[PDB]
Amino acid sequence: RKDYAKLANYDESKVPQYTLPSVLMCHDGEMVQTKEQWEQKRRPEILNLFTTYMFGKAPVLKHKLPCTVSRINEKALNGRATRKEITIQLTDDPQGPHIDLQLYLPNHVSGKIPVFLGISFMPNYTIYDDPDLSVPEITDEKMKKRSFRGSMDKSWQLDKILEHGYGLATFCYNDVDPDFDDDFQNGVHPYYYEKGQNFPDPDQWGSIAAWAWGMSRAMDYLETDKKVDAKKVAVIGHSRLGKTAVWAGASDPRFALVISGNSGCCGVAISRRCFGETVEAMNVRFPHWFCGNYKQFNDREKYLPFDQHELVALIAPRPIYIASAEEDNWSDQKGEFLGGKGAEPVYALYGLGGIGCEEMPPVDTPYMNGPIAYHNRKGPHAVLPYDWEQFLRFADKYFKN
């Protein structure tokens, strides 16, 4: 019902007073001052609070899901790449939902290959204009195409990625759970209900948590593929899928590097600023996104047990790239910058520096010599070739020698 877009505040001066919850102080009040105390005592407290109160618990599995490598082309893209389709069975029902993962690896590169794991709004054929993914429309019985081959090429830059000697793997988020407020009708959630349960408990996963769990299932296959380097898998997504990729990085330490693509409100942006999008605008307009518990903080940011700098802190010591867009005031770009700045004291526990500047930098001015990178670039809320340029130059610092 309510608007929210026109009620929002975009005026830095009308931003309220606030105090950031202290990331280094435990629940019992003892301050952390060593990485040991962070890993042993404080980090699990913060992981617990984000799992309990905003993203929701996700199933732990006795064993890996079944998958099959259902298609391979070692001469894909005129011999430039090997293309693999991997279907991952998400539930115990083989006619239930599956992740249809699409992996591209460069040919002519010897070792195990670093890979960017991404999650997309649309099906796999939009990632690249791949001409041998082609059967005519008049004979096609498969799902009717809503976009076109390679429509999202500007958001994925496969050519840039292969050129750095890296791979790209992606799946569409609707494989795991449709982005509709439908009580998870056609998603994975009901397959993991107990017999006396007909919707997730208030502390159990919503959609973002399920989509993140999906990336983790894709990593379960990737780490068994002899050509990919299981030590150098990055995660990336944009907007709601940026919120997802940050959570997947936070709750799955296997991932080597995290890319926040305009993750904004309830991503890396500090909620207490109440700038642009707000917790309540979020939960009211997308109630399936977060767990039941999170709705208690509608218009009540003062009472969050945490704020989003502590989410970023879950990444440390691993690197994270925070990307803002100049026109995307809805994401609160300064707030996104401050989400990274608030995490600096944890990274210092590992003897690492910070972003590299004290106040928010001007547009088109990246900082990436520290463990947390930041840019706010010209133009619109999206992931553009400009963003991939910075992403890949940051990744080279960690994956190349």
Coil/strand/helix, residue 46: helix
Max CA distance (Å), the chain: 68
Is residue 57 a known part of a binding site?
no
Nearest to Na ion of 18, 191 (CB atom): 18
Nearest to Na ion of 188, 265 (CB atom): 265
Q: Please report, as residue ranges, which positions from 42 to 71 form the binding site for Na ion (by CB under 5 A).
A: none
Whether the CB-CB separation of 120 and 126 falls below 8 Å is answered with yes
Is residue 243 a known part of a binding site?
yes
Interaction between residue 106 and Na ion (CB under 5 A): no
Give the up-direction half-sphere exposure of residue 190: CA atoms within 13 A in the CB hemisphere: 11
Q: Which stretch binds Na ion (CB under 5 A): 36-44, 170-178, 203-211, 326-334?
A: 326-334
Minimal distance in Å, beta carbon 108 to Na ion? 45
Is residue 318 a known part of a binding site?
no
218 to 257: interface string for Na ion, x by CB under 5 A: ----------------------------------------
Minimal distance in Å, beta carbon 277 to Na ion? 5
Minimal distance in Å, beta carbon 331 to Na ion? 7
282 to 321: interface string for Na ion, x by CB under 5 A: ----------------------------------------
Whether the CB-CB separation of 23 and 309 falls below 8 Å is answered with yes
Instruction: For residues 335 and 320, give the distance between their C-alpha atoms in angstroms, rounded to a whole number.
Output: 16
Asked about 381 being catalytic, the answer comes back as yes
Q: Which stretch binds Na ion (CB under 5 A): 79-87, 127-135, 288-296, 324-332?
A: 324-332
Interaction between residue 276 and Na ion (CB under 5 A): yes
What separation, in Å, do the N-terminal and C-terminal C-alpha atoms of the chain show?
54
Minimal distance in Å, beta carbon 212 to Na ion? 21
Give bridge partners of residue 324 from the DSSP assignment: 376
Residue whose pair of structure tokens reads 């997308």 in the numeric block: 286
Whether the CB-CB separation of 333 and 379 falls below 8 Å is answered with no
Nearest to Na ion of 220, 280 (CB atom): 280
Find the Cα–Cα–Cα–Cα dihedral 91, 94, 95, 100, rounded to 10°. 80
Residue count at the site for Na ion (CB under 5 A)? 5
Interaction between residue 32 and Na ion (CB under 5 A): no
Closest CA to 205 of 213, 217, 216: 213
Whether the CB-CB separation of 117 and 235 falls below 8 Å is answered with yes
Whether the CB-CB separation of 273 and 14 falls below 8 Å is answered with no
Instruction: For residues 279 and 137, give the distance between their C-alpha atoms in angstroms, rounded to a whole number.
Output: 43
Nearest to Na ion of 184, 275 (CB atom): 275
Residue whose pair of structure tokens reads 């919707």 in the numeric block: 199
Interaction between residue 336 and Na ion (CB under 5 A): no
DSSP assignment string, 61-85: -SSPPPEEEEEEEEEETTTTEEEEE
Nearest to Na ion of 237, 339 (CB atom): 339
Minimal distance in Å, beta carbon 14 to Na ion? 13
Nearest to Na ion of 67, 281 (CB atom): 281
Find the Cα–Cα–Cα–Cα dihedral 193, 197, 201, 206, rounded to 10°. 40
Nearest to Na ion of 152, 338 (CB atom): 338
Q: Please report, as residue ranges, which positions from 254 to 273 form the binding site for Na ion (by CB under 5 A).
A: 265
Closest CA to 211 of 248, 236, 239: 248
Catalytic residue of the set 120, 207, 239, 260: 239
Query: What's 98's DSSP letter?
Result: E
How many other CB atoms sit within 10 Å of the CB of residue 24?
16
Asked about 239 being catalytic, the answer comes back as yes
Is residue 85 a known part of a binding site?
no
Q: Which residues are annotated as a binding site for alpha-D-glucuronate?
A: 239-240, 243, 277, 285, 330, 381
Where along the sequence are the contacts to Na ion (CB under 5 A)?
265, 275-277, 332
Q: Which residues are annotated as a binding site?
A: 239-240, 243, 277, 285, 330, 381
Residue positions annotated with a catalytic role: 239, 381
Q: Which residues are annotated as a binding site for beta-D-galacturonate?
A: 239-240, 243, 277, 285, 330, 381
